[PDB]
């Protein structure tokens, strides 16, 4: 491997394009980066109008990511340290999650004080929590992976994307590696190491051996009127383990994005073999209990805007390994296959940085520490439980699956991808 080397990096999404940029930025000449969908990615979980950013080997990676938030200028323009409340309803939530910019919150009208009067209405009953009024806050999603993907390309990186070009329909298997990849128009791309960086996509591709369970979560929008936005901005981000969250409007749109909490859905499918595989897709809509979650929380901080028809609405995949912990290594069999997954739900602030672990992982720089955290671990995943709640809380407490989804929203489609 040298920096002239075919590169490949199957997925552009939050990991594949932090993958390409910092190849780019150490030297790498000839990377290319397929994905079925023009970036940002309509099924990509960074292609969002904001995330939450905040802030042992996940402290060191945390503080990496949010350096890069803070210092590097190509990603300064999209992080508003705007603060956090993290909060919670009941003592099993709290539990789950002197700084002089920490505060404690138990009483209603502590919360309803985070933002100017009008703004947080609500009651928040038996709310408790925590506020950092600084070095947290929010990310434009989709802006910052568009200026990432648009920086690696200026510095050489071919992006292939769109369908059928840039769908890889197989990796090339041959004598027990990975030698690149096969799109969908039946183009060979062969390479001397190939990125798997597809997200909760990635098991179509080899086995995992049960290590991601790909699962599903769910956002909608709410459109405030041009006359009612100046009073939600700079608001600071009002997030409950046990109920969702929701962020200061966008400007393009003036809309309110809101996630409802919960522990996920799968889509496990049933094989001829016999065999139990969760299988993402798009749906530019969510369940019909993700909407009545949505509009209970609203009740409880917004209650204004608790009846609102939803202006966009969509489920967003990840995938899970057993413990939540990344899934960066090269694999033990395929010499030449190096995996960038496994982000658990959390991974898009570590775009400005993770691209450097994976890259690291290729060259096998990996600290030890990190390495034994991160690497690829079978024995984690075996007799796996994929019921697994892995610390999240809300609506049923439990795992759910979209087959067992009756009924979805109706809100009129809008194409992410532009
Ligand atoms: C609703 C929701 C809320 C979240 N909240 C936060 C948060 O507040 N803060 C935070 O840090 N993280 C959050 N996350 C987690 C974060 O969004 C993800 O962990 C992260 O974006 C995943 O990055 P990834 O690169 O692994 O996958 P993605 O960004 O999803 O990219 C995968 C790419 O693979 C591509 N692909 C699929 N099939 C193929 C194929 N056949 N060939 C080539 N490419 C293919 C897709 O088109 C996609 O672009 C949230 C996620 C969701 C869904």
Redesign the pocket.
Same mark, same amino acid.
């Given at each position: 491997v040298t920096k002239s080397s075919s590169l490949l990096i /199957? &997925? #552009? &999404?939050?990991?594949?394009? !932090?993958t390409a940029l910092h190849l780019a930025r150490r030297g790498y000449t000839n990377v290319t980066v397929? =994905? +079925?969908?023009p /970036? +940002? !990615?309509? @099924?990509? #979980?960074?292609? =969002?109008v904001? *995330?939450?950013?905040?802030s042992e080997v996940n402290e060191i990676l945390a503080e990496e990511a949010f350096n890069g938030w803070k210092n590097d200028p190509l990603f300064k323009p999209y992080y508003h340290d705007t603060g956090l409340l993290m909060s919670a309803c009941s003592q099993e939530g709290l539990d789950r999650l002197e700084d002089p910019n920490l505060v404690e919150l138990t009483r209603p009208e502590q919360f309803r004080k985070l933002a100017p009067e009008g703004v947080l209405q609500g009651d928040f009953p038996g709310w408790k929590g925590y506020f950092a009024r600084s070095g947290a806050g929010?990310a434009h999603?989709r802006n910052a992976?568009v200026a990432a993907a648009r920086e690696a390309q200026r510095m050489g990186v071919k992006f292939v994307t769109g369908t059928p070009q &840039?769908? /890889? /329909?197989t990796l090339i298997f041959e004598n027990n590696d990975v030698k690149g990849?096969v799109?969908?128009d039946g183009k060979i791309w062969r390479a001397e190491r190939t990125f798997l960086? $597809?997200? $909760?996509?990635?098991g179509?591709?080899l086995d995992f051996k049960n290590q991601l369970r790909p699962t #599903?979560?769910?956002?909608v929008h709410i459109a405030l009127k041009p006359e009612e936005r100046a009073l939600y901005k700079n608001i600071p981000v009002i997030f409950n383990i046990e109920r969702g969250?929701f962020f200061e409007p966008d400007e393009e749109r003036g809309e309110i994005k809101i996630?409802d909490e919960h522990p996920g859905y799968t889509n496990m499918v049933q094989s001829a073999d016999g065999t139990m595989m969760s299988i +993402?897709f798009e749906k530019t809509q969510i369940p019909k209990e993700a909407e009545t979650r949505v509009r209970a929380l609203l009740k409880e901080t917004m209650p204004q805007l608790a009846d609102r028809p939803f202006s966009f609405a969509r @489920?967003?995949?990840? $995938?899970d390994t057993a413990n939540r912990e990344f899934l960066i290594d090269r694999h033990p069999q395929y010499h030449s296959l190096v995996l &960038?997954?496994? #982000?658990?739900?959390?991974?898009? *602030?570590?775009?400005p940085s993770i691209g450097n672990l994976i890259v690291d992982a290729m060259e096998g720089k990996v600290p030890q520490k990190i390495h034994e955290l991160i690497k690829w671990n079978p024995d984690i995943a075996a007799n796996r439980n994929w019921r697994d709640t892995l610390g999240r809380f809300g609506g049923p407490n439990r795992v759910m699956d979209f087959h067992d989804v009756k009924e979805w929203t109706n809100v009129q489609y809008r194409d992410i991808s532009k």
């Open positions: /199957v &997925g #552009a &999404g939050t990991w594949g394009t !932090s397929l =994905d +079925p969908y /970036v +940002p !990615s309509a @099924i990509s #979980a960074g292609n =969002d904001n *995330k939450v950013i905040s929010w999603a992976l &840039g769908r /890889v /329909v990849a799109t969908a960086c $597809a997200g $909760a996509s990635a179509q591709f #599903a979560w769910t956002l969250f996630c +993402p @489920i967003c995949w990840c $995938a &960038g997954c496994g #982000a658990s739900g959390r991974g898009f *602030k570590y775009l």
